[PDB]
């Protein structure tokens, strides 16, 4: 019963930094993107106008992660039954490679869409109590930034929520295109960068302690 705060894939320092500077360059480009500035109203006075690198500038520092299960040390929400899975134990501390299909921004959060492998999905838990009509692991994400009081698993709920729009074809076609991928918009600040090339990152399926 040596359970962590939460299971998940924790990117390397290298890759995590790679995802960061790419995430920040995404924030910068979309901020200066014309069409984004056209829907700047949907995202008192224009003292700062809008600088996205500062809008979610608050970002928990360290290695990024895609949380599978939140344990809280010991069975909090069936966590000890998660850790009892031979798949989880055999995978604990092992190395894995996550695939960042597409980055995204929303008025609440900003993150990355992780498309887990079948082997990586064996870990992902279907327990929690927009997910309707979307395949398993669709919640798989990596929070890259939250604007102040946006304080929960909201980048995963946003990502899934943005994936519901696309489910029905709300993508809205290429609203434009940034470097390293294509751009779309589907609602109030519901912008999405579909990376033309998957940003594959290196991570380890361990758990946090602290």
């Amino acid at each position, epitope marked *: 019963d040596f359970l962590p705060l939460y299971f998940g894939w924790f990117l*390397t320092k290298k890759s995590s930094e790679t995802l960061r500077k790419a995430g920040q360059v995404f924030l910068e480009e979309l901020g200066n993107h014309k069409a984004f500035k056209k829907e700047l109203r949907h995202f008192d006075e224009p003292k700062e106008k809008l600088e996205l690198v500062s809008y979610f500038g608050k970002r928990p520092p360290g290695v990024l992660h895609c949380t599978t299960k939140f344990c809280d040390y010991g069975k909090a929400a069936g966590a000890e039954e998660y850790a009892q899975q031979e798949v989880v134990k055999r995978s604990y501390g092992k190395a894995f490679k996550l695939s960042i299909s597409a980055l995204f921004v929303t008025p609440k959060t900003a993150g990355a869409q992780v498309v887990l492998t079948d082997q990586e999905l064996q870990l992902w838990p279907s327990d929690l109590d927009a997910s309707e009509g979307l395949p398993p692991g669709s919640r798989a994400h990596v929070t890259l930034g939250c604007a102040a009081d946006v304080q929960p698993v909201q980048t995963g709920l946003d990502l899934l929520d943005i994936l519901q729009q696309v489910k029905g074809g709300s993508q809205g076609e290429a609203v434009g295109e940034l470097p390293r991928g294509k751009l779309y918009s589907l609602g109030k600040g519901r912008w999405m960068l579909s990376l033309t090339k998957k940003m594959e990152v290196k991570a*380890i399926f361990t758990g946090y302690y602290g």
Partner: nanobody
Framework: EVQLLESGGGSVQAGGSLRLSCAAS????????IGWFRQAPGQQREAVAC????????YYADSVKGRFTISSDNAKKTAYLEMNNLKPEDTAVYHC?????????????????????????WGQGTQVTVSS
């Protein structure tokens, strides 16, 4: 063929000094991090230190700071822990651990766990035993 050739330990007395040397093989230079973990009998392993063959940056447990000093002859692909002021509470079977996945010291941090058998290596044993 990843294999760690650790050595340089043994029995000493309090206040003494040792030098654990780990010649890691089977990894490139700059994409691995080499550091020892000491796991005393009946306690949990703790990262004593590591050194990144890329950054050249080192980590130390607070208890071993200034007393132990890790180093890496990246060319020879070996690392050395310069243990000093060794106390009896530093008795354990020190284990050279190389992280090939992350040249960082990130997973030497006590906040995570890294099975060094996946993309790294685990030293069998260099037994340190301080006395008096």
């Amino acid at each position: 063929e990843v294999q760690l050739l650790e050595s340089g330990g043994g029995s000493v007395q309090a206040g003494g000094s040792l030098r654990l040397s780990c010649a890691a093989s089977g990894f490139t230079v700059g994409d691995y991090a080499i550091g020892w973990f000491r796991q005393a009998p009946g306690q949990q392993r703790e990262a004593v230190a590591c050194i990144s063959t890329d950054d050249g940056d080192t980590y130390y447990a607070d208890s071993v700071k200034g007393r132990f000093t890790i180093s890496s002859d990246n060319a020879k692909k070996t690392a050395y822990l310069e243990m000093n002021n060794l106390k009896p509470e530093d008795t354990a079977v020190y284990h050279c651990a190389v992280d090939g996945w992350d040249s960082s010291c990130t997973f030497y941090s006590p906040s995570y766990y890294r099975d060094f058998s996946d993309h790294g290596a685990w030293g069998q044993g260099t037994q340190v035993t301080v006395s008096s």
